[PDB]
Amino acid sequence: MKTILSNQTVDIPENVDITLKGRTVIVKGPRGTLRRDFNHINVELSLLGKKKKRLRVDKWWGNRKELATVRTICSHVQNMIKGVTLGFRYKMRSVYAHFPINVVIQENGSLVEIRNFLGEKYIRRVRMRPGVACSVSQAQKDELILEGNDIELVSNSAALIQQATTVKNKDIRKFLDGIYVSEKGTVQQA
């Protein structure tokens, strides 16, 4: 069964200005500008709301497996607004038993250096995606803070270092060592 129509409206706040180039939305607010194409998803992005108030996505004569693509665009846009108004802040804490995990950033972010994981000599280096500002925190002992605007860029950089600190040939039920994402938050809370 093809469904005749499904849609959903995004409530754009007053800080931001969204302006769509056909199917590629660009989103600029206080912190910066973000962009994301959607020339794979085949929907109608309307900007019906005036002065600027609604990004409305249609789908159209689509069936089950494409009607699902309606909201996933809707969310990819609010995440874009929530990233340019407040900005994402992923926190990750270092966990270990004996050997202290020794983090130090090296350019501004862009190089997270990890010594002494499980006592290993091999020093692990981890790039960051562009626009992600990694930083060693304060008001906590073993804790990094990854900031930026793109949820996509920030959270995979978090995974890049969460997946770099993995144990081999052990029972990871016992050896609970590594740097784990502890809190997916925001920069400003409002």
Binding site: K2, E44, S46, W61
Partner: protein, 138 residues
């Protein structure tokens, strides 16, 4: 974004099939591929018609969703579809495809001579405007 929506009252130009080259008002939608369609004044009996064989215009009219051939005769008579079409450019490149196929061998000769002179007066001017765009470059 779209601007021509299959509606109750949208006028459509019939692409091909038995009624090709006429206008028609969409009375009702039967299914995903078939519409109950009616052209009263363009001599099309009320019948089903697939969308794959009709391309829809910019006109609308305002009969209700199952009106009966007398109220769609109005709202097509007034608001004057039959004279507003034939003022479209659509209806003027139609009736140009018509007029090349309906062209004797004599006519085809007059235009061979007429166009040869037209193409030359316009050619001497373009050669003259470039003379002026090069003198302006000076």
């Amino acid at each position: 974004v779209f601007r021509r929506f299959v509606e109750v009252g949208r006028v459509a130009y019939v692409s091909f099939g038995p009624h090709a080259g006429k206008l028609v008002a969409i009375v009702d939608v039967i299914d995903q591929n078939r519409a109950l369609v009616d052209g009263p004044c363009t001599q099309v009996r009320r019948q089903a018609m697939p969308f794959k064989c009709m391309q829809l215009t910019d006109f609308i009219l305002k009969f209700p969703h199952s009106a009966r051939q007398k109220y769609v005769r109005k709202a097509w008579e007034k608001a004057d579809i039959n004279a507003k079409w034939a003022a479209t450019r659509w209806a003027k490149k139609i009736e140009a495809r018509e007029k090349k196929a309906k062209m004797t061998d004599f006519d085809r000769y007059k235009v061979m001579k007429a166009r040869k002179m037209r193409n030359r007066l316009i050619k001497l001017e373009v050669k003259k405007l470039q003379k002026a765009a090069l003198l302006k470059a000076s």
